[PDB]
Ligand binder design. Structure first.
Ligand SMILES: CC(=O)N[C@@H]1[C@@H](O)[C@H](O[C@@H]2O[C@H](CO[C@]3(C(=O)O)C[C@H](O)[C@@H](NC(C)=O)[C@H]([C@H](O)[C@H](O)COC(C)=O)O3)[C@H](O)[C@H](O)[C@H]2O)[C@@H](CO)O[C@H]1O
Ligand SMILES: CC(=O)N[C@@H]1[C@@H](O)[C@H](O[C@@H]2O[C@H](CO[C@]3(C(=O)O)C[C@H](O)[C@@H](NC(C)=O)[C@H]([C@H](O)[C@H](O)COC(C)=O)O3)[C@H](O)[C@H](O)[C@H]2O)[C@@H](CO)O[C@H]1O
Ligand SMILES: CC(=O)N[C@@H]1[C@@H](O)[C@H](O[C@@H]2O[C@H](CO[C@]3(C(=O)O)C[C@H](O)[C@@H](NC(C)=O)[C@H]([C@H](O)[C@H](O)COC(C)=O)O3)[C@H](O)[C@H](O)[C@H]2O)[C@@H](CO)O[C@H]1O
Lengths: 114, 114, 114, 114, 114
């Protein structure tokens, strides 16, 4: 598996606008919401759950990188795998998107797979 | 269990105004005090104890996130479970509230369970 | 045991003014010096030694919090247990005080036991 | 092996201009892109994969230092070993360079092997 | 053993001027270069190797502290044990000094052994 697999979705020119940390089923988790830097489109919500999904091994690196990009407000590409989380009230509050990578974005390209 | 269970309480548009770190019964712990950004309401105090309560697995993430939000002074939602901590002098100094999540707020927003 | 036990001493309205990191007997340790925010009184010197004293479990959280409050320069209450360290040259350089907690202070009170 | 082996390559007077974090084959990884501080030359890309290559033991230190130099924007020397990564779509997106060290640079010399 | 052993050397009123991170013999390492705040004297170089020397247990704490003092540029006392590293290309690039402690300095004294 790879962040860059074409079975994963991605959204360019996004800004991490919200950050949440919590716990579910003995597992710390975090969620982010991102919006287009230019104000178009609809928001993206993605979460990482420490003890769950094939992406669990990168939980710490993703949380640290999310905090970093959240704190600068820079434009990034968010990479997700859709339809991962399954507890309905969790998905309702957040989404079923697993966060699988984060890329900085230059003026006219993003530094990550497409 | 989940941060967003309806048996947990939450408080919105709060600012983390104080932070304490200590040890009790061989456990590092931390506590926070939050006040409404606009000066209304009554202060909220919540604590996390590494090694105690069902929320112990999320101690590190919550301590890191509390420090982050403390440093920015931004408005947040604090999620708690009431009536958890026992030692009466500890409760009297701080509270019996376990900290169970932290969410950012964007203009009385709050990105977390509701 | 608890940071707030009345067998521990505390000092309010202090600022962390020096920081040292070293190793002794295979243990990383750190020490801090605090002074009253108004410059009155005598400095408080306290140390934490990674594998030693009943306060060993909180070494990492105390080191991180000491660095945090040192870098902000904000007023704090420092909590210590006296007469812990024993190596004379170490005690003469620093002190015998074990660091057992750190509380942020407002202008009117400190967020911690007293 | 050593960062400074003459079988590694290095590039001086660079600035870390992009940063990406993801997961591949159960390993967190990160990649950076660097460009000449003075606008000359061609960009350099290098990656570190947490449990792959001889350089895996330094994954955390390299990620922390890459983030540090990325956030300061200061001039650095980047050290790489060529032709390490092999998944073609990964190499196409980033490169086959393994990141093996990072050195601060003054206006005249870089503090690292040469 | 102790940072303050009289068999260790130290240099007061120094500023950390350069920082390098790499790997040698499967171990992360870092080096720092320091110069007198007054711009006098010869530079001091010292290195820490995770996994090597009796000071290996404090590698993480010294790296974190070196990074901190590097970012502030404040005056510090550097504590070293001479003649520890022996790979000649390494020593010639950096030095044989093992870093064994870091102390903040005021105007009257540095907060560490002497
Ligand atoms: C009238 C019309 O043509 N409308 C658009 C068309 O403009 C868009 O084409 C370009 O898309 C560009 C960015 O492409 C990505 C991206 O990098 O973010 C590619 C992603 O593969 C795609 N992700 C998914 C799951 O499809 C992503 C999203 O479509 C997009 O980011 C919207 O996200 C949200 C939640 O709002 O876009 C860039 O946006 C250029 O402006 C576009 O011209 C086209 C693709 O977006 O769709 C047509 O409807
Ligand atoms: C006349 C009247 O109705 N007065 C108030 C009414 O205005 C309040 O409604 C709005 O509440 C908003 C905040 O809502 C929450 C919050 O998210 O912070 C919902 C929480 O569920 C609630 N938590 C608990 C345990 O009750 C929390 C607290 O009630 C509130 O934060 C005060 O807490 C403290 C310690 O001070 O409020 C917002 O404040 C709007 O401006 C209000 O219009 C309503 C809810 O507070 O109660 C009525 O008594
Ligand atoms: C006519 C001519 O000879 N042109 C250039 C010549 O100017 C260059 O000489 C000086 O090189 C200086 C930098 O040296 C290094 C470096 O530290 O960056 C040595 C490195 O070993 C080398 N790395 C590799 C893998 O070969 C590196 C790269 O060549 C260089 O950094 C460019 O890399 C990229 C991706 O653009 O240079 C410095 O640049 C001086 O200003 C130069 O005068 C000479 C070496 O670059 O090459 C000749 O073609």
């Amino acid at each position: 598996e790879w962040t860059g697999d074409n079975t994963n979705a991605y959204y360019s020119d996004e800004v991490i606008s919200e950050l949440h940390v919590g716990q579910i089923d003995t597992s710390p988790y975090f969620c982010i919401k991102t919006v287009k830097a230019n104000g178009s489109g609809t928001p993206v919500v993605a979460c990482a759950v420490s003890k769950q999904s094939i992406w669990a091994p990168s939980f710490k690196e993703l949380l640290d990188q999310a905090r970093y990009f959240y704190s600068t407000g820079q434009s990034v590409r968010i990479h997700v795998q859709k339809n991962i989380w399954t507890y309905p009230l969790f998905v309702n509050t957040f989404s079923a998107n697993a966060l699988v990578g984060l890329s900085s974005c230059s003026a006219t390209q993003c530094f990550g797979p497409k």
